[PDB]
Amino acid sequence: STDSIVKASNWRLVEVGRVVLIKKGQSAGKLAAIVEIIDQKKVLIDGPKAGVPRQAINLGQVVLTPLTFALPRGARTATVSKKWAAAAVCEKWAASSWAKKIAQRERRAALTDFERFQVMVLRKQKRYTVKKALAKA
Amino acid sequence: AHFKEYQVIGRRLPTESVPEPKLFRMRIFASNEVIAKSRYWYFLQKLHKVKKASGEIVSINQINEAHPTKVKNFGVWVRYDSRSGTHNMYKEIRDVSRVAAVETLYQDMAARHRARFRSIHILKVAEIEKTADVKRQYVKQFLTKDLKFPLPHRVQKSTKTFSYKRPSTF
Amino acid sequence: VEPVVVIDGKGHLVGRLASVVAKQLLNGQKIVVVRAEELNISGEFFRNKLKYHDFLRKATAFNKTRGPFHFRAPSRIFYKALRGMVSHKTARGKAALERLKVFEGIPPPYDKKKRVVVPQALRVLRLKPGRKYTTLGKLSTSVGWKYEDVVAKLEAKRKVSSAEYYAKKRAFTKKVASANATAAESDVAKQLAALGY
Amino acid sequence: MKYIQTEQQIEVPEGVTVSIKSRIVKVVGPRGTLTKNLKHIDVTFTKVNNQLIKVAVHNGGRKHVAALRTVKSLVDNMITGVTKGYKYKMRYVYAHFPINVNIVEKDGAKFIEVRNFLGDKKIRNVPVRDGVTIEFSTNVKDEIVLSGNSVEDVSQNAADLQQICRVRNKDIRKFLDGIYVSHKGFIT
Amino acid sequence: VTLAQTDKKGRENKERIFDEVREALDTYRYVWVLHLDDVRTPVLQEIRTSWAGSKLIMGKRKVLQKALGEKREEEYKENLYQLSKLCSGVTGLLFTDEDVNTVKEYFKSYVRSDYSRPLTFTIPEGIVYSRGGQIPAEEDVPMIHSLEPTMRNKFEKAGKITIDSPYLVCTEGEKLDVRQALILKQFGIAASEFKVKVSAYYDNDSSTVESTNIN
RNA sequence: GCAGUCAAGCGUUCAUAGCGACAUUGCUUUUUGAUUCUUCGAUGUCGGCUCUUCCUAUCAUACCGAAGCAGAAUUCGGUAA
RNA sequence: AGAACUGGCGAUGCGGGAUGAACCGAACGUAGAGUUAAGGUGCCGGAAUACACGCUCAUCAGACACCACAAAAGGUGUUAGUUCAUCUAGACAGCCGGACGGUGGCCAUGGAAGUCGGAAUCCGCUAAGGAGUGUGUAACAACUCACCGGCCGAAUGAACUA
């Protein structure tokens, strides 16, 4: 116990190969990988598997996602597409909780009124078993 | 606006006893076609003795970027008019295409040196092919290997007027 | 969206809060603002003192009673900055300021209810880091509010009572989440997951 | 010109340990413990391995980077105070009136008392701060010695002790009375 | 800002000493490199006038390293690069052609006395003086009062300067402080002997590297 | 102010075109504290009693700075109505 | 105070400049829907607390033509520039060592020995060191710089432009 407990303050930091999510624009919710950083506020992105074209973007329009993978700086679209498959980030993305939350509110919007009735009848059944399990232990 | 780089070609006048005037081309940064024809006579009258009524324009062409998705260092020579007499300036921009780099230059001149569009003359925009001959400092710091920088203290723009979460940064 | 909305006053800016409050009062929403003594003003402390003093000397020369009443309390300072935004001379402005209640601290019954914040008026989202601000609770003490030794004492009494509630609430949520976890994997749970709940 | 990142390096010797939650800095070692607040200064601390700690400022201008160097200068002064300590030795030149300096405790407050300064009947008190010990130099005439762990606890009490004896309404070139700081040094 | 007469030399002076080393090699057949860290200026001159046939060149290190040729392959004359690596201290190269014995006899026989930068002296507990107890104090002249604020600050009554406690400025068997060097330096005590040393000799026509050590 | 000596700056590419700051040097009734009682003519109406306020460009009191200030007595400057 | 060409006010409302005979848009029957001018979009107050690159902190900041404010000249406050030199054969800063013989040079003199002063003002040896940058002793001495050298390892200094 003669150790320096100094905190790390972990951060998502931009680099080559930091995969990102485009929140607004033409793409609107697609994955893409940063190819080369231009300056403080602009980068150069590309995702071939998702469908976003290669373009330069401001960092205001994009959000940082914690997944990374190894990729050389200044790569072309064929080379990013090959590295994309080797990391298999499209499988690693759906494992994360933040991708599941996106899909859930997408599904709750597409619910039919009859399906919105079926959500109701099940939650009336689920709360009956819980309140018996509660208030005994 | 979105600048578009244009080539304009000028041929003074075919007259008797002087056939075939030579020809004169320029590269013009202008937001559309009609300004670039008028921006052409603004320079070409300064160089030698012609007029628009003593002139006609041969052909216009839109010069696209040769390689958009490649990242280029650009060194731009600029002459401009101040409140005092005119004087030169050399500046360096790192950007995506030629015609997007002039966009960031006029914003840079209007911010720091308070120069509108009419005062600035664009001398030569050149791509610096090799690295490590970049003169300026603020362009040079992005050329270090394995450059990684965090973005601390991000704000969040929320549409509802009231939020209940006591909102938090990064 | 709610009948009476309780805005927590901590960490906000005077002007940018009072703008978005004044629009809701003119639209019919009832707003009650609590913890006024924690409100913040941009700029350093010595500036905002002198912006008060050149205001403080402006009063009617032939009779000082009839002039601009220089209120001192942090709620009253904030109520001033809001009152200039609503057109308070008409009948529309009088009925718009009767929807507003501003308090120092949190008095009962507003401690039992939820408090909210306004994201376009937070200090920590608006100003750039490395920039001087000013606490309004210190400011009114420098110009004659003889109650900061009282309001801060009642908060230290409140927060101990509030910390006992939260520990009771957190242990009850622990029992529910454990009961909800063992309720999962049932046939009613798996059909909900398909529909998204 | 918006420097992208700048860093300094604070060296930690073998005696001391430092534990830092958000900006509160604690230095624990041989002679004692010292703490310092840093909520206003806006930096990021990072340990590499147990003897070197990097500070960092990302994307800051010239005024923000200028404050980064003095953070290194403050934490280095904390480490030396815990290892070597600080000792200020002061002398007091009197022209004609001998200065009586004593240490009196007033309900546990330990005030430094100055008498007979330049023929004044006024009895001045100088309070001793927390973490500074005042002792009189054995076998050296006319010396008062201040020693403590923190620089700011000692060096303020050194400067407070001299300004209370300031000469007024007189030509200072002829009247040379006062208390002065001889030199600034370490305990060991 | 200043208005002094003497100006900076520049790069051309560094290339002139680069020129002087090349011509001195083939003319004088012996080359002598020396470690002379602390030297006095009239001591440097009298070595030049005791060796009138010689040429002596002092200069910066990497200039003198490159003037011999710091690389193995690149050099003025052959087998020159091994001796250049050895000379770590401040050097002044020497060029005499008489003898390999007389030169190593000369530096071992030559010795002077300078500042310490050993023996111990105590300041007497009376009035201090310029010599400070070297000669009897009745013959002594008291110190100037103007350098007393230097003594209360840097060296750590009447105009005659008084100590009340006895002070020892040195102790034997001890490395002296840089400050304790200045205490003897101000009093005028040059009791420590000074001697210059040589590390390597070279012969041009023999063209081999000679390695030795004298202290 | 005029008569000069300069030249820190300017005159489309420029010394000597043309200006030309800070400076600098000279008289306009007496370089030796003698004099020298020289008050050389304002062409539309305000002054004072009482009694409040306000400006600071501060004469006095408050705390300071510099001095070419031993003390005393002063001189100069800052905050301050 | 008096003229010249054209427009306007007087004779003329309406939208914009908070307010305004003269400015900006536009000239009037009574009404409905549509799009705009000049001006504006935090709240009063109808309309983006829209987007994008920068700059600026004021112990009297600043905010939009006519218009209700200002001068020269200064400011290691900040930013971007020009021309010049130094530099990985080691710059800038820092400590550390050298800074000498002719000669205490000549008149000045109670006494400056480089430094109360006045004219004057070269060599020797040098990597380098002034017939001397300053602290000053009554005159000496000493210290320092201006000149190099050893450690030390990334660019730095100077004027000027706005």
Residue numbers in the entry:
A (entry chain M): 2 to 138
B (entry chain S): 2 to 171
C (entry chain O): 3 to 199
D (entry chain H): 1 to 188
E (entry chain W): 10 to 126, 132 to 170, 176 to 234
From the paper:
Ribosomes are the molecular machines that all cells depend on for protein synthesis. However, ribosomal subunits are exported to the cytoplasm in a functionally inactive and immature state, requiring the further addition of ribosomal proteins and the removal of transacting factors that block ligand binding sites. Using cryo-EM of 60S precursors trapped from yeast, we captured six intermediates in late nuclear and cytoplasmic 60S assembly at ~3.5–3.8 Å resolution, which provide unprecedented mechanistic insights into 60S maturation.
To isolate particles immediately after export from the nucleus, we used tandem affinity purification (TAP)-tagged mutant Rlp24 (Rlp24∆C), which fails to recruit the AAA-ATPase Drg1 that initiates cytoplasmic maturation. In the ECI particle, the NTD of Nog1 remains inserted in the A site, displacing H89 and preventing Rpl10 insertion into this particle. In addition, the ECI particle is the earliest particle in which H69 is folded into its nearly mature conformation. As this coincides with Nmd3 binding, Nmd3 may promote H69 folding. However, Nmd3 also appears to drive the flipping of two bases, G2261 and U2269, distinguishing this structure from mature H69 and priming the particle for activation of the GTPase Lsg1, the release factor for Nmd317,28. Nmd3 binding in the E and P sites promotes two large-scale rearrangements of RNA: closure of the L1 stalk and capture of H38, which constitutes the second RNA helix of the Rpl10 binding cleft. Comparison of the Nog1-containing ECI particle with the Yvh1-bound PL particle reveals that the NTD of Nog1 and the displacement of H89 by Nog1 would both occlude Yvh1 binding.
